[PDB]
């Protein structure tokens, strides 16, 4: 993983079996951490046959990707997300702590638009962006141009670092959600597909196609739908437990792939 943009697809039913809300929110945070550890660019929540909790799953994932200084302004932190407090930290480049320094890249929430341009929250004191028509209430990437009583920034995105993931809450099933992002390589993982250990060099090569790959995960119970995937593998051959939970399979699989993509 040095380029190949990865997109993970997860069923909105991943938290269905876990009753405890604290545990359920923590479950979803493990996915945020797994995605971030391996530099995943996007997480896709799709509608699984049963009923789902897409809203909750999306909410936790986004809360986690959002810098600490902005979640309290972006998240009404009501009942649903009450345990959001026991989520593990996420130490990524877009999650800086402490006052902003010159030349530093930060994500900011456009707040109020003034005559000078747009006022934005970057985690210090309201900063001003000169690019007049920045639409308010958005989270954008900025570069700190200059400091002062009113910091100055310009919209800008780093390319030399990990910048988090975008979470797509398509309320559509897998087939269509896949149809949306449509990547050049679609890897479907299944306990019943050939062990990765056998088709290893094939996967190594395809993934090197290197555009954007979509990794698909189903539940421990129901396998994926009759979908179109460039490859089908069991990335966890010889499991010794009757089941492998999705948060687990996500991490286990991202790790195996991380090594195939150099």
């Amino acid at each position: 993983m040095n380029r190949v943009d990865l997109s993970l697809f997860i069923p909105d039913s991943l938290t269905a079996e876990t009753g405890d809300l604290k545990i359920k929110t923590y479950k979803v945070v493990l996915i945020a951490r797994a995605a971030s550890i391996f530099g995943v660019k996007r997480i896709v929540i799709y509608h699984d046959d049963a009923d789902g909790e897409a809203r909750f799953i999306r909410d936790i994932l986004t809360y986690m990707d959002t810098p600490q200084y902005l979640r309290r302004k972006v998240f009404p932190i009501m009942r649903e997300l009450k345990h959001v407090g026991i989520l593990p930290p996420l130490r990524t480049p877009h999650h800086p702590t402490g006052k902003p320094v010159t030349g530093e890249y930060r994500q900011g929430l456009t707040v109020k638009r003034v005559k000078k341009g747009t006022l934005v929250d970057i985690g210090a004191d309201k900063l001003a962006l000169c690019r007049e028509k920045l639409t308010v209430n958005r989270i954008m990437s900025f570069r700190v141009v200059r400091l002062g009583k009113e910091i100055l920034i310009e919209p800008d995105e780093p390319e030399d670092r990990y910048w988090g993931y975008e979470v797509l809450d398509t309320r559509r099933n897998l087939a269509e959600s896949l149809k949306t992002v449509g990547a050049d390589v679609v890897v479907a993982t299944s306990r019943n597909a050939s062990p990765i250990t056998s088709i290893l060099d094939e996967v190594k090569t395809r993934m090197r196609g290197a555009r954007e790959a979509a990794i698909l995960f189903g539940g421990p119970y129901k396998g994926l739908p009759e979908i179109d995937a460039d490859i089908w593998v069991n990335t966890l051959p010889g499991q010794c437990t009757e089941t492998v939970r999705t948060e687990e399979a996500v991490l286990a699989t991202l790790s195996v792939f991380n090594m195939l993509t150099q």
Copy 2:
């Protein structure tokens, strides 16, 4: 993976940064799952930072390895483990839930040395084995030979299926803990080390020519002391996060090695 017995070494400081007890027990449970998923033979808990919760870590992991038809009698009401209820299930060969049948294997708790021999607590009801020396109040494996009222079982644990892990609470440190429990191959993980992706064939060769391997996991905040290992390696090249929790590292690493020690 098989014919390559795995032991992993984890620090007694892994639950140190979480105040929440429920999450804290759940985190140890994740280690219990990663271990079982990959058929780990044992979990060695070593000493490292200031304080620690080697005992708490030892209790949760054991609680989970221990069949549910025993926990109630093997574990006293311990305030520390009040959230054992939310630990994720572990469906393993040694965790049968269906009543005892002929030729099936079951782990049993020894209860009392009886006139004929010894009564062990197997699956459902109460049964017995012949052997007397069988120390009481200790768990061991047996295989049901004959059912009925006085079901008889003979001590024996399979070697064809996974049979859980044993928890080793060496109250010694990393180095002193390697001495206590030996393996012919020590693999040390670290971000500072050479990436698995480089010394790959090498690692694979050492791993397959295995007997018993020990995978060492340090913390995310410190790493590992300069112990002598047969292989130093970063199984997670290019992490985008500043830290990788031990529980994360354990699972991620196990699946990378799991991919290497497979067989034709």
